[PDB]
Amino acid sequence: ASWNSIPLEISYEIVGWIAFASWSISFYPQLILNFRRRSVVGLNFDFVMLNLTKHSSYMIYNVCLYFSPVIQKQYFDTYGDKEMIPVAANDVAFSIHAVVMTAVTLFQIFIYERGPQKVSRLAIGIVVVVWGFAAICFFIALPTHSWLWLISIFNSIQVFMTCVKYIPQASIGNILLDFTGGLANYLQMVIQSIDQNSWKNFYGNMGKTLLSLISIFFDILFMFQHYVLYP
Amino acid sequence: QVQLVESGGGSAQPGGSLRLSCAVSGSVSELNTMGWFRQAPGKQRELVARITATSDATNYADSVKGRFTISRDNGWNTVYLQSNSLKPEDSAVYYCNVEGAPSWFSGIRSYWGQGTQVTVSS
Amino acid sequence: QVQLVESGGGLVQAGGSLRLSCAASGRTITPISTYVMGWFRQDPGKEREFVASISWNGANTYYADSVKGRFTISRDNAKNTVYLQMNSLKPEDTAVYYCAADPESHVRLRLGVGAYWGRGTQVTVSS
């Protein structure tokens, strides 16, 4: 399916690349500090592992649905053949960038001074259980080539890992950047739905729908706590 | 869990010097700070010095600035307190402190040992 | 691969009418009725220039400032056909008119970087 309105298509591209930038720029400050220090002391090792799980899972869904004519046909067979694919180029760019950045972090953890830091049993357990389940789903889908079903599991895994990021977490510049990308990724989906006259993209990409809303709600909650509720 | 064991101290004369040691044992997901607190008899805790683990920044109480120095070994296994130009007001039980998170799910936790006595008198 | 076949080109007097048609067909992952369709034109040593475009919903039409008000674009999604009704023709309108299509972007089709192009139909305006 193609865009109807020229201004709505341009709006959707501008809000998408704003979402890409506000969420990709935050990877560099820690990475630069770690290389200069030649150490990872101060970094949460559990969070690095949980984020590699989340970013690889979202990346699988975005790259596959964006580039595979085969998986795109499965999408059309499920939500409608007049539907627009709900994965934008900025989603693909965000995902690949977030995996490379997280992989650089892991390489830094491996080469650099670690101090008394170590991934917790509870975090290793979450990751092992999540990866095991994903491997169970890869083998169930492999004979029937159920690739839309498989990457929708990968997308639900990122929604689980997104809940793990915010729920325990419950200064302003980083919150504002995170909130901007959540609102920009949500608004992107709205603009698409308005133009196509269809809300199916919210169901076909329930991972992006929840990733954006979990981010918005939780960042609003943190801003409400640091300024209204207590100080 | 984190185990902290304090060494050094005892008595010193005004103007004298003492070096404190804290052996760090165990592991966390994230080390936040390493420091020293002290409690004079019947008083409250007083942070003496602290190293911020994310930046390597050293911070001190105003009453000890220029006389006391916090330091560590390369592997963050030991933290030191070089107590120079000792004053009677420096008499207290000194406690080595470490702040860090056991996991992502449990916030930062504060660990301290049983402490070492430092008494300064003529 | 989508084939775009133009029709309707020919000689016309200044001030007259000519109606171009373009039939779209080919093997596609998305239905051709969901494609952006349009028209471009070209004069000998010049770059191809935008003429008109129509969204797959049929509600958004775009025109070049020079043809605005005289040329009307319409489409028939049951036939996969796009039309250009050219009224009030001027000698300057003499050019090869290319049909153009894009499976996803109205920006790319308007910008001239659309995926599919027809072979062209020569339109000649006499005096």
Numbering used by the authors:
A (entry chain A): 2 to 171, 184 to 244
B (entry chain C): 1 to 122
C (entry chain B): 1 to 127
Provide excerpts from the study.
Cystinosin is a member of the PQ-loop family of solute carrier (SLC) transporters and uses the proton gradient to drive cystine export into the cytoplasm. Cystinosin is a proton coupled lysosomal cystine transporter, which functions as the primary route for the export of cystine out of the lysosome. The transporter comprises seven transmembrane helices (TMs) and uses the outwardly directed proton electrochemical gradient, generated by the V-ATPase, to drive cystine export from the lysosome in a 1:1 stoichiometry. To address these questions, we present the crystal structures of cystinosin from Arabidopsis thaliana in both apo and cystine bound states.
